[PDB]
Design a protein around this ligand. Structure first.
Ligand SMILES: O=c1[nH]cnc2c1ncn2[C@@H]1O[C@H](COP(=O)(O)O)[C@@H](O)[C@H]1O
Ligand SMILES: O=c1[nH]cnc2c1ncn2[C@@H]1O[C@H](COP(=O)(O)O)[C@@H](O)[C@H]1O
Ligand SMILES: *Cc1c(COP(=O)(O)O)cnc(C)c1O
Ligand SMILES: *Cc1c(COP(=O)(O)O)cnc(C)c1O
Ligand SMILES: NC(=O)[C@H]1O[C@H](CO)[C@@H](O)[C@H](O)[C@H]1O
Ligand SMILES: NC(=O)[C@H]1O[C@H](CO)[C@@H](O)[C@H](O)[C@H]1O
Lengths: 830, 830
């Protein structure tokens, strides 16, 4: 059937009876009233059973051996569905497929019932999920820590061409994967005041919120290692949240508990954009305060909570603990760790600071200013008074370091300060992170260099040893084996299976680049994928596409810097050319654009309306026929990504040079047989470098060109004046060609494009359509297109998250990865 | 060990491995980190497994056979713990005891970990729970329908002698008994307006709240019948509760979902008191609207949803459905059933009304005016506009019936109206219930007569056939076998086990009233019970009592009509007499008073402070010694009742004649070996009548005496003037003898007692202490006390809820009870 494992005799029988046990005893249903949703749950519980045994021994193992522990703090974890992934990592897929078949059910149909765990916005959250899978596969004693939002990223609905947001109640029917651990609830403080008494400061008169943990298992790939993802939930105490007496109402006091519990209610739907709301700051401190207590508790036991030197010496803390900060969201971990060490454990400042810097490491993910976290001091002042005092003291000492290294450089001092003066004073969280961590890294080579050269230049000059780079990666398990079993099978047929946890081995495929059978197969699976997606489209969304055309797709969050607008201009150009010479042959294309816009991002929402507006015109023009279709992919998410990517021919990674820190969707497309048209931005550079620029469609300005233009001054009128095809489009938009009933509907887009385009869309227009012509040329030659594809796939190995994690491990965390199978799952009950 | 069933070889082994399965696979723990709480859950899941098989076949059975269905609507269901009860009804107790023992654990210790299901206030809610157990034991196709409050009755804490209320988070650790059924969610409407169009009215522009059901199994006693208790939870729709667009904030819209979900958040802690708050009205309509939809759906399938006459003829509705209204809380069921039949199904008014009256039956529970539900019309008008219109039409037609029967009686018309004019117009829910039901019943003989003679006189004259009586009862399973296995065993030793589901058989014990061994045994178990309770007291609450003294207990909600104050006066009297003649012998007594006061009931809370104030004085007077102890039993609840009642010698049921509709705690004490001192009120009359007044300590005014006094005019000064012992107490209260630091602390109590005592506490004072002297006299003669006890126990059979349900069944519902074992639980999987 494929290498989804063995469908053993004993195990298919065992699976079936357990499927029936759960349907009866767990779901309390009988075959006669059971629905697909019930069947899905019986299977999920049956699969979950197989990894609890491993989960328990893994955790027990780490307790016995006591290795260095990795803590990955992130406010986002974009997990997606987890049934199939679990089957894959446990080699259960074929057995489950068989068993459910014998039970008379379609596993694929059941898999579609599982709700996505959308606890993230985009790249940053998905990176975290890929990292977890890799850390488990490389046998690292690693823990993912976050917030268990009951409402994840909103579900997007397109009404009359506009985006409609609706609550994502992913827990509505339950989550069979998590395991509530109410017994490990912890208290978290807010507000209050600071009392300076005799021997130390005291954080007093605080409001308490309880943090209840929920553990989700993270299975490694076929090595019997099951790590833990601990997500916190906010709960109100039953005392003060009722006990602070003297009139108000007993009922009202019970109803008001949903005020402290609102902390983990909803994820903030902003991607690369900072909103300074108090609720967000609360979520940030919440995950940090609870997580650290758990970290120190585990440390206090270790082998110190037995003997060792005997005396809670936190000198070994950094040798046993490593906490990674995913962006600046969990930045309060630094001042929080100091508060606990200084205020509670009573270490001296300096010893405490040495410990903190040595255990903390920060990852930066963007250079755009509007994404930078600068919290107003009046907020920190009220909500976390002691942390503010600690931050001012960290700043004081740091700045003294600076003054001593750069005597007289008074502007450097203000530029480096953690405190920003002006309208309102703010705290620059990124500066905090750099000062309190022993390593700061970028997510792609160019981005990392940009940090050193630009944004964090002064910091780099002060401590050059802190700055590193760790190019992002993706997991070949979910992003290849899981979503594209067909491609994975034909690869395995030639080079075996060891590449799933050693993607570098994909290079061996280079020697099949002239192989006639392989070229035929690679081209076959991509055609099978396109057919399946074309079907799904009419199945769930309804209104036909042509599977023979080139599948041109751009799926990612809607942003001005990602330039879906630049993609829009090209689509309109194709349309206009066709209308000019109808009877001329052009390569057919189905251009699919999908992505979510943050609720408050007016421009982003205006862009989604434009895309659908273009499709209304293009898709109903009889002269165009089936040569051009413009489709907006609704509710783009992980599970949807797993469907489109394997069906794509062309991947659009056209951000303005120097704005996309890395990107990861780009890597997903590369490993799945799509060719890339893009700019020399983020990881695009390393991908072209790995595959050879001849096998990549690169165009537009490089970072240096962008800066030159800025010195000069960017003027969009010039481009408007010198390109008639461009001029024709802008005037079509301006006159209502795309919005008849509302002729001025797109005035904001045009106005912006002409007068305040921060991302110079026009500057790359000519080179973009010229370059698009070259891919259409190559697509006309099936054999050569597929051969270039094989050059990409065969060369994508460097982009596996296993490689990324192995580097973080050795260069930042100080631990050694290991592909050693944990001693089986075998029963045991001590 | 006792007759807690057989501890079979095969089953103790089977239980153990299943206990281990769950501890591993369900709880995901290993013996080395498992806590008592974990052990409790493993056991609970192991026990729950045994009744799912029966649950499924019972429900399937009712679907096949299609008998008449009973629907018990109640806003309260005071269930208490459910582990032991389940073991008892399944004959699993000894097997579980053995198995857990072999596993090295104490079942009793684990049982103490289960949280009480406090979804009720007192009598009314507990009656509902006892009724469910009985309906299952008598094989009735019955369903309990209510609200799944996430916060039940508050937990009471005594701080400095005052009651402190704190949220009852009973779901904090989970509920292994319920089974969420999100797939059966239903929509419920609120607000909106009525559109009268061509063919009928239309309820339009409503706000929708979703009702999600949760089923809990209700096992009958050893007959393999497992009925269902369906509790609704409020959920916000994800559309409009987000989709009603045009600025407000996306975050705020998601946070505001906890506004529609507040409906099932907390139970209203009022016992026999009406609070006209909008939230309460919402809860009331919520349970009714959801429940009825479920009722009609099941009806539409029946055997009509196949064939029968063919044409949704609701003429057979009453032959297939019976809905019992527990008090007036679910009274909206009447106008709601009309709205669905008339507005949706389009039946004519008259046919619809005939159906409604024939399926609905109402139970009244109190005669005090402040407990009567009179909803302001402006509330109904805004929240349920169509129901108000239907109510006015029901009233219109009813009043026309009245006018036609009593021509010219214009005052009768206003007195009978469902609409009350005055300050604000109100709707008298009780009148609604009488007009729309085919049977109205009281809960004890005297109470029922009082309804006919007083409160509902006019209604009785119009339709005498509607009024009936159904004396309350309690379940011998939880209230005897479960809480007092020792007494149950010695009874079984003489007369067998058939009395557990046939309590009348307890009469056979009369012939052992002179049996020397039996008297010794009955007295032995009561001494063992008192010792165990005396221990528990120091264990969990700490500060000694003497097990040899008489256990004088009064446990029920704190009310002015229940007269804990009258009990207080006697206690102070005993104290004062002792202080007068210290060296005189008196029978030692530990007087235990326990109960919860509604948060807003100032007087009730003042009484709790008095009780503790008396104990502070009495309990620390060296002259008193161990002859008198005053203890306030904290957080009185079902699980606590199961501990004190079996340890009581004297039961206090001293409400003012004509105020306690029935009572049930009284019956609990009678079946457990305590003698009763009380007034001729509620069921007390029938209990004395059953045991013989010679075996009962009756005192005080009868109903007739109370009325005579009211004609005359009650003047408390008289009693104050003529009784020096009484005068001495009032002056002790008045001068701070019981509250040194705050001398005027109890001025409200004294003021009330002297000037506005609605329940004439002073009027029964003399006869009360005189009567208390007679029980002390009898207690001095152990042999005769125990013989009188045997006369009570042997004669309590009439007070089993099996008898009550069998009457409701035959005289109101029109169904025949059956003690037939359902065809085993045996596997099966169709
Ligand atoms: O005190 C202890 N005795 C024995 N095993 C322990 C103890 N503390 C932790 N463990 C084991 O280590 C696992 C790790 O627990 P953690 O504290 O949540 O990381 C637990 O599930 C147990 O298997
Ligand atoms: O359409 C049907 N076919 C077969 N069994 C049914 C059907 N509807 C209900 N049942 C059975 O009747 C039980 C009663 O379901 P209820 O509707 O919740 O009362 C179900 O759990 C099934 O065993
Ligand atoms: C991989 C992924 C992303 C990141 O895509 P980019 O193109 O790097 O912006 C975002 N959303 C989803 C659903 C993803 O799977
Ligand atoms: C039985 C019971 C009641 C009812 O007692 P009464 O004395 O009738 O008022 C109230 N609360 C609890 C906990 C009960 O078990
Ligand atoms: N999605 C994102 O917010 C950011 O982090 C991702 C993961 O590091 C990057 O690939 C992306 O370029 C950046 O905008
Ligand atoms: N507890 C109560 O509210 C009421 O209903 C109970 C059950 O019918 C009665 O026994 C009680 O006398 C009455 O006050």
């Amino acid at each position: 059937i494929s290498v989804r494992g063995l469908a053993g005799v004993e195990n298919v029988t065992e699976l079936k009876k357990n499927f029936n046990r759960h349907l009866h005893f767990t779901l309390v249903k009988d075959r006669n009233v059971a629905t697909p949703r019930d069947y899905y749950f019986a299977l999920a519980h049956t699969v979950r059973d197989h990894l609890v045994g491993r989960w328990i021994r893994t955790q027990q193992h780490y307790y016995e051996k006591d290795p260095k522990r990795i803590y990955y703090l992130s406010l986002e974890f974009y997990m997606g569905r987890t049934l199939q992934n679990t089957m894959v990592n446990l080699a259960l897929e074929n057995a489950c497929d068989e068993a459910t078949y014998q039970l008379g059910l379609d596993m694929e149909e059941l898999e579609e019932i599982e709700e996505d765990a959308g606890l993230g916005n985009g790249g940053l959250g998905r990176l975290a999920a890929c990292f977890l899978d890799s850390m488990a596969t490389l046998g690292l004693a690693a823990y993912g820590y976050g917030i268990r939002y009951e409402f994840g990223i909103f579900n997007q609905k397109i009404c009359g061409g506009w985006q409609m947001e609706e609550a994502d109640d992913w827990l509505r029917y339950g989550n069979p994967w998590e395991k509530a651990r109410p017994e490990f609830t912890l208290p978290v403080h807010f507000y209050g005041r600071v009392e300076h008494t005799s021997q130390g400061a005291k954080w007093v008169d605080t409001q308490v919120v309880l943090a209840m943990p929920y553990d989700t298992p993270v299975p490694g790939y076929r090595n019997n290692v099951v790590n833990t993802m601990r997500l916190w939930s906010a709960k109100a105490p039953n005392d003060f949240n009722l006990k602070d007496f003297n009139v108000g109402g007993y009922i009202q006091a019970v109803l008001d508990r949903n005020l402290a519990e609102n902390i983990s209610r909803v994820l903030y739907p902003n991607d690369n954009f900072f909103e300074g709301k108090e609720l967000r700051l609360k979520q940030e401190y919440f995950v940090v305060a609870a997580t650290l207590q758990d970290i120190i508790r585990r440390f206090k036991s270790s082998k110190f909570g037995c003997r060792d030197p005997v005396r809670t010496n936190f000198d070994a803390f950094p040798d046993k603990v490593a906490i990674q900060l995913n962006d600046t969201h969990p930045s309060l971990a630094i001042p929080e760790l100091m508060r606990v060490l200084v205020d509670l454990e009573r270490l001296d400042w300096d010893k405490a600071w040495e410990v903190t810097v040595k255990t903390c490491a920060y990852t930066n993910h963007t250079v755009i200013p509007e994404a930078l976290e600068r919290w107003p001091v009046h907020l920190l002042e009220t909500l976390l008074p002691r942390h503010l005092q600690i931050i001012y003291e960290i700043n004081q000492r740091f700045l003294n370091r600076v003054a001593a290294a750069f005597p007289g450089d008074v502007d450097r001092l203000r530029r480096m300060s953690l405190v920003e003066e002006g309208a309102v004073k703010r705290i620059n969280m990124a500066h905090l992170c750099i000062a309190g961590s022993h390593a700061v890294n970028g997510v792609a080579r160019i981005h990392s260099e940009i940090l050193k050269k630009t944004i964090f230049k002064d910091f780099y000059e002060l401590e050059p040893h802190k700055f590193q780079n760790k190019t992002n990666g993706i997991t070949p398990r979910r992003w290849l084996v899981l979503c594209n079993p067909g491609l994975a099978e034909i690869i395995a047929e030639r080079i075996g299976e060891e590449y799933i946890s050693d993607l570098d081995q994909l290079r061996k495929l280079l020697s099949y680049v002239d192989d006639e059978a392989f070229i035929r197969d690679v081209a076959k699976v991509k055609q099978e994928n396109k057919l399946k997606f074309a079907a799904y489209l009419e199945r769930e969304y309804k209104v036909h596409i042509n599977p023979n055309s080139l599948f041109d797709v751009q799926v990612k969050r809607i942003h001005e810097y990602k330039r879906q607008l630049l993609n829009c201009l090209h689509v309109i150009t194709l349309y206009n050319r066709i209308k000019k010479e109808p009877n001329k042959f052009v390569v057919p294309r189905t251009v699919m654009i999908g992505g979510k816009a943050a609720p408050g991002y007016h421009m982003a929402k205006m862009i989604i309306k434009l895309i659908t507006a273009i499709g209304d015109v293009v898709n109903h023009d009889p002269v165009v026929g089936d040569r051009l279709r413009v489709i907006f992919l609704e509710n783009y998410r992980v599970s949807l990504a797993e469907k489109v990517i394997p069906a794509a021919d062309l991947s659009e990674q056209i951000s303005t040079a120097g704005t996309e820190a890395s990107g990861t969707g780009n890597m997903k497309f590369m490993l799945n047989g799509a060719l890339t048209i893009g700019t020399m931005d983020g990881a695009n550079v390393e991908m072209a470098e790995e595959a050879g620029e001849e096998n990549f469609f690169i165009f537009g300005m490089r970072v240096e060109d962008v800066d030159r233009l800025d010195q000069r001054g960017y003027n969009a009128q010039e481009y408007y004046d010198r390109i008639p095809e461009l001029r024709q489009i802008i005037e079509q938009l301006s006159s209502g060609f795309f919005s008849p009933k509302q002729p001025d509907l797109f005035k904001d887009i045009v106005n912006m494009l002409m007068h305040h385009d921060r991302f110079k869309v026009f500057a790359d227009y000519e080179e973009y359509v010229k370059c698009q012509e070259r891919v259409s040329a190559l697509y006309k030659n099936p054999r050569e297109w597929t051969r270039m594809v094989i050059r990409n796939i065969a060369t994508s190995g460097k982009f596996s998250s296993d490689r990324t994690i192995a580097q973080y491990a050795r260069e930042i965390w100080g631990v050694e990865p290991s592909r050693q199978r944990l001693p089986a799952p075998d029963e045991k009950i001590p």
